[PDB]
Design a protein around this ligand. Structure first.
Ligand SMILES: *CCC(=O)N1CC(n2cc(-c3ccncc3)c(-c3cccc(NC(=O)c4cn(C5CC5)cn4)c3)n2)C1
Length: 271
């Protein structure tokens, strides 16, 4: 869908960063009498070295991922090209999962945390089936539609417009190699962020020192709520050998087994 600036309106500002700005807005599709609540992401201008017609063609090839789609992967509703690129998707009212876990710390039970792990692995498995590599999986790029339904966003957005060292696999930090097995490493880091209720990975350690710390065998610590069964899964996502890391289909099954008896795998004061 190519959107005209008159089809949508930016009401409030939801987020802001170097990437650009996210707006909570409204969209009235052309020839329809309905107003759909959406989120508009206005990316930073002159970021990409590509023409508008080149970006548009590549985003149309990439949006083929909305077909047949997955419930745990965001659908790109529309794109609007002016001086900036504007991405329009359905509004996710609870924000990102990074903020959600930090704000509801003492109210999240083991059942929720394990279900989120399952849902993220389901969305990632789908992206792997469509052969699209995310490149930026993190708890900040997981959106909360409802506390029981989460979705992955910003997949392939970096590739579309030709740097999170603390979420990158060793081969991505050293050789800029981005496969589905490096997305597994990022997934392990993401799971650690949910398990620690939004802690920042390797806090204080400069990004410049991450690759040397990884080669010494140092990994993210074992979160207080994780039994060794859950920590071993994350620890396997951070292996040096990419092909030995688990697959998204194995992670869905492992975390589904854990979500069937959650108090056995996660120890939370409140369950
Ligand atoms: C919580 C951390 C934070 O501040 N972040 C900003 C970023 N974020 C949030 C949203 C969003 C908020 C509310 N409701 C929905 C989304 C977005 C966002 C907005 C619009 C569009 C997107 N992404 C895409 O449209 C898109 C397209 N692709 C592929 C075709 C290339 C991938 N993603 C995201 N961003 C989290």
């Amino acid at each position: 869908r190519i959107l005209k600036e008159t089809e949508f309106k930016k009401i409030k500002v939801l987020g802001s960063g170097a990437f650009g700005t996210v707006y909570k807005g409204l969209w009235i599709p052309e020839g329809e009498k309905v107003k759909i609540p959406v989120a508009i992401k206005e990316l930073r201008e002159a970021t990409s070295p590509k023409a508008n017609k080149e970006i548009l063609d590549e985003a149309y090839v990439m949006a083929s991922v909305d077909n047949p789609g997955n419930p745990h992967v965001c659908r790109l509703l529309g794109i609007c090209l002016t001086s900036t690129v504007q991405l329009i998707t359905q509004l996710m009212p609870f924000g990102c999962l990074l903020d959600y876990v930090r704000e509801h710390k003492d109210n999240i039970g083991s059942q929720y945390l394990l279900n989120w792990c399952v849902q993220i692995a389901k969305g990632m498995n789908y992206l792997e089936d469509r052969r699209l590599v995310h490149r930026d999986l993190a708890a900040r790029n997981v959106l909360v539609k409802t506390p029981q339904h989460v979705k992955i966003t910003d997949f392939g957005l970096a590739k579309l417009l030709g740097v999170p060292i603390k979420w990158m696999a060793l081969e991505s930090i050293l050789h800029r190699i981005y496969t589905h097995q490096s997305d597994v490493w990022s997934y392990g880091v993401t799971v650690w962020e949910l398990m620690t209720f939004g802690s920042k990975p390797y806090d204080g350690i400069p990004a410049s020192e991450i690759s040397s710390i990884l080669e010494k065998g140092e990994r993210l610590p074992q979160p207080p709520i994780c039994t060794i069964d859950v920590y071993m899964i994350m620890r396997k996502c951070w292996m040096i050998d990419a092909d030995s890391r688990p697959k998204f289909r194995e992670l869905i099954i492992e975390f589904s087994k854990m979500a069937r008896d959650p108090q056995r795998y996660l120890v939370i004061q409140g369950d």
